[PDB]
Amino acid sequence: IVEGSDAEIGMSPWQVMLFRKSPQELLCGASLISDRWVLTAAHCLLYPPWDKNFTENDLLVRIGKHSRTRYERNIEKISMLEKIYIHPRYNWRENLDRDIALMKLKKPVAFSDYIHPVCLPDRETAASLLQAGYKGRVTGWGNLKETGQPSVLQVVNLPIVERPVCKDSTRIRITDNMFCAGYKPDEGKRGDACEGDSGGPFVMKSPFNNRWYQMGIVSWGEGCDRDGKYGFYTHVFRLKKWIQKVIDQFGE
């Protein structure tokens, strides 16, 4: 995250670290959506073009983390994955359309003051919150600038940006499964996700039921926190039905 602060302790109980076993390294972020399921971008797992194809025993998920590199000895819990499911229609070839994948845990996790799931939106929540101007929150342990790494989880709040502005800002073709967020240079406030941040959650707090919902998945951007550019995220509601299906399909 660029231009944000260090998150407070247990401020993001649903923040998951996708971690490579060997070389032991942070791949991406991720969100806990039940005690057996985690949600992340499909490009964290598969990107044939750079030769990336992570398998199930290639990875670990770490939940309850705050520190980027330390092992938080009786605070974080590490789990093995049972399955990886990418959206059958994820476009890795042109624009990262449907950059969403589900990892079902080898065993359910126990919740704690540090570990708690995020809610997935319903057509109405999605409908009254996903409005330009509205602010969401991103988190991750990624890059601090486009071109170090943080010791703690970072956080930044961003406004949802109007589609047309979205489009007008890149040469990549933008689909309905995506939304962009950031401040306008006129606005004079910044912050953006950045490499290493991908797969993390973009979330809003309902003013109706005081609950936290994940609206977005950290997807791609032209450089981090560049003036006149905006981060792009998978549109978690547009994809709920797919997410509803696999869980029903072979879920918890």
């Binding site: 076993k21 390294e25 092992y71 590490i78």
Partner: peptide
């Protein structure tokens, strides 16, 4: 740079 993780998990 990553402190070590427990083998119970590797």
């Amino acid at each position: 740079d990553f402190e070590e993780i427990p083998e119970e998990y590797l």
